[PDB]
Each structure stands twice: as structure tokens, then as C-alpha cells.
Design a protein around this ligand. Structure first.
Ligand code: BGC
Lengths: 28, 126
């Protein structure tokens, strides 16, 4: 039942690089 | 209202992701056995999108996403399903349907004996 509050951070070109590297899609 | 489909993908570099995440201690959650941790991510005023990444150690976890409109109204962005995020980094994006709060559900409720270590990041972007 725990609840955390996170403040999102601005996505950066650096961040986005890693995330994209060797990306494979997913469905649900 | 009307809701855009989310986008979700995996990527292979889990050790690196976890190391980077671990350079901040508030980015690491322990989900107790049989428990569910909800991460509330409000929509940024300076952004139109939510971005998330997450992973675990040595076991899967249920992951899903809801949107809380700002008793309240909830839409189901991502259905809660067990993800093998101990093997790969799981990630995704969703366009803001409007002003509100996102609910990331890390769901361990089916796990009798095993805690889960969750590494996660949430972002906004235009
Ligand atoms: O998508 C169908 C919707 O039905 C509503 O009753 C629920 O609040 C949502 O969980 C769900 O998204």
C-alpha cells in the first residue's frame, strides 16, 4: 500500500541516447 | 476525453542502467513480498510527455500505469503485467492526455517469499 511521489526530470539528449541504444519494441 | 496509446520498448544494458541509477539512492525502491508500491508522477507544466525506465534484480515484477485526472477518474495507460525486467531494461512513453498525475504500479502482490529491488527513472519532455 506504499505510495511515493516523484518529480519527473527533463529528458536530455544524453539520457535519450542510452535509452535508444539497441532498443527493441514491446506490446501489451 | 481520448487517450493515446503508450509506447514501450526494452534495451539490453541492464548493468550499466542500474549502476547509473544507483548513483542516486532515492531512485531505488524495495518492494516488499506481497506488496504494491505506487509511484505518483504529476504531469509537468513544461512538458507534453511522460517517459519511464525501470529494472529489477534477479526476479520479475508486475508493472503497469494509470492516469489520475486532476473519488477521482482513472484511465489505464499500461495494463499491469509481469515483466522480465530482471533480464532487460523496460521503458516507455505516453503523451499527456491532460493535467493530472501518473500512477506507476510496481506490483509484487503475487510474490510470497521474495522482495523486489526496483531501479527506476521518470522523465518529462516536449
Ligand atoms: O479502459 C477502460 C477503463 O474502464 C474504467 O472503469 C477504469 O477506471 C479504467 O481502469 C479503464 O481504463
Amino acid at each position: 500500500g506504499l505510495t511515493i511521489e516523484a518529480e519527473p526530470t527533463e529528458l536530455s539528449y544524453q539520457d535519450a541516447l542510452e535509452m535508444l541504444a539497441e532498443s527493441k519494441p514491446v506490446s501489451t | 476525453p481520448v487517450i493515446a496509446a503508450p509506447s514501450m520498448w526494452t534495451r539490453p544494458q541492464i548493468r550499466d542502467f542500474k549502476e547509473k541509477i544507483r548513483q542516486d539512492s532515492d531512485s531505488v525502491i524495495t518492494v516488499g513480498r506481497g506488496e504494491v508500491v505506487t509511484v505518483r508522477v504529476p504531469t509537468h507544466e513544461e512538458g507534453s510527455y511522460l517517459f519511464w525506465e525501470f529494472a529489477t534484480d534477479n526476479y520479475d515484477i508486475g508493472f503497469g500505469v494509470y492516469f489520475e485526472w486532476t473519488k477521482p477518474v482513472l484511465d489505464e495507460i499500461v495494463p499491469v503485467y509481469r515483466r522480465d525486467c530482471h533480464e532487460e531494461v523496460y521503458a516507455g512513453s505516453h503523451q499527456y492526455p491532460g493535467r493530472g498525475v501518473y500512477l506507476l504500479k510496481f506490483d509484487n502482490s503475487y510474490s510470497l517469499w521474495r522482495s523486489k529491488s526496483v531501479y527506476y527513472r521518470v522523465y518529462y519532455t516536449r
